Symmetry: C3
Subunit: 108 residues, 3 copies
């Protein structure tokens, strides 16, 4: 009698337990799949970041080259300018020579 009441109490507990276990298992299966998906996406990200770092490095290399190019062009300009000064000097000298020639002719 009293033993049968105890056994009833025990059978119900076990029922409720088995049910918990099933639901726990479902929950765990769900999380497993979520985690794998996350582990997959992280790999994707890392791939995309390594890709980008390389592009950054290439761009850096291109910025350097360009800066050097610009410097050389800035210099070439200065050489050109220095050359123009010399030309202007010659031209003023020539203007003067022409004037002086004109004066000799005018006197004679």
């Amino acid at each position: 009698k009293q033993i049968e009441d105890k056994i009833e109490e025990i059978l119900s507990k076990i029922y409720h337990i088995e049910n918990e276990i099933a639901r726990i298992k479902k929950l765990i299966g769900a999380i497993d799949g979520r985690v794998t998906r996350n582990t997959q996406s992280i790999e994707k990200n890392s791939k995309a970041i390594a890709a980008n770092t390389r592009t950054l490095q290439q761009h850096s290399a291109r910025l350097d080259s360009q800066q050097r190019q610009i410097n050389e062009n800035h210099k070439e300009m200065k050489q050109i300018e220095d050359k123009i000064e010399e030309i202007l000097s010659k031209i003023y000298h020539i203007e003067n020579e022409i004037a002086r020639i004109k004066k000799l002719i005018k006197l004679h």
Copy 2:
């Protein structure tokens, strides 16, 4: 009798349950370690992305500067060209003066 048969049925259930519980615990321990690893890798990624964003910002700053440099060089050129025009003008004027001088000498 019948009670002993019930108790047998109960003991087996419990056995099978305890086994489930152990295997569930293993599964959960595994996922925990996977998750920590993922949480670690994500931090790595974020660090690498913040690193890259900064490089991007620095490059942007360098592109601006370079563009400004190029503009100034494009301008300096235009100044140089305008100066050359003036030189060519003077040179044609001089050529003309020389010709006219030659004519005076030829007449006399």
Copy 3:
């Protein structure tokens, strides 16, 4: 008697089991929250990487344009230089004409 001893053994097992189940449930709840947080951070990362890739693409476009600009400026310079040569030639020719004029005047 012996049955009551068995039932005692069974009741304790169930107690210990229920406790395991609770603690398992807590553990699982914890991991769930960790995973969601990770899934959230990964999305953040992906957003930040797509953002950066676009910036990289824009920078590439700007490096191309700048390189083309620099090339044109390097060319314009060469045109300018070729023009200067011609000017210097004219100037030497003029110097010579002036000298020869001077000689005619000196003779007469």
